[PDB]
Design a protein around this nucleic acid. Structure first.
Length: 111
RNA sequence: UGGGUCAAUCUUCGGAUUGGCCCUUUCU
C-alpha cells in the first residue's frame, strides 16, 4: 500500500509534465502562470489520444489540472479582470469579480 | 463533486479501506 500511492503521484507527474510539454502557454509554469479558460478540461481531453500514446490517461490529466490549479501561485494570479487563456495563450475571457474573491479567500484559508 | 467498473487487503460477513481505468462536477 506504501508504493501503490507513490505510483499515483508519479503517474500524476507524467500527466502534468505532458501538459507542460505539449501546451506550454498554459501549463509551463517556468515561463509564467496565467488563468485558464473556463472549460479548458474539455479542450485537453480532445487530445486524450495523443496523451495515451505516452501512458497518460484521461483520469490522470484531470488529476493533474487539479494539482496545477490548487497551487497557491495559480490562485494568486486569479485577479479581477485578468485574462483567461486557452491552451495556446490566446485571450478568450476575463476573470469575474466573484471568481477573484473566491480565490483570495482560498489563499487566506490556506496557511 | 458524485457515479460505474476491475485489482489488492480486511471483516463482527451487514461490509469497510487503498489503487488503476471511464463518465461527470461555478471558480479546469
Amino acid at each position: 500500500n506504501k508504493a501503490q500511492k507513490n505510483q499515483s503521484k508519479r503517474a500524476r507527474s507524467d500527466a502534468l509534465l505532458w501538459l507542460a510539454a505539449n501546451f506550454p502557454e498554459a501549463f509551463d509554469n517556468s515561463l509564467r502562470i496565467r488563468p485558464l479558460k473556463i472549460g479548458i478540461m474539455s479542450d485537453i481531453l480532445q487530445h486524450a489520444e495523443k496523451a495515451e500514446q505516452v501512458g497518460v490517461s484521461k483520469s490522470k490529466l484531470r488529476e493533474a489540472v487539479v494539482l496545477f490549479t490548487r497551487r497557491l501561485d495559480y490562485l494568486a494570479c486569479l485577479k479581477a479582470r485578468e485574462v483567461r487563456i486557452d491552451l495556446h495563450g490566446n485571450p478568450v475571457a476575463e476573470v469575474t469579480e466573484e471568481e477573484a474573491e473566491n480565490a483570495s479567500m482560498k489563499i487566506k484559508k490556506r496557511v
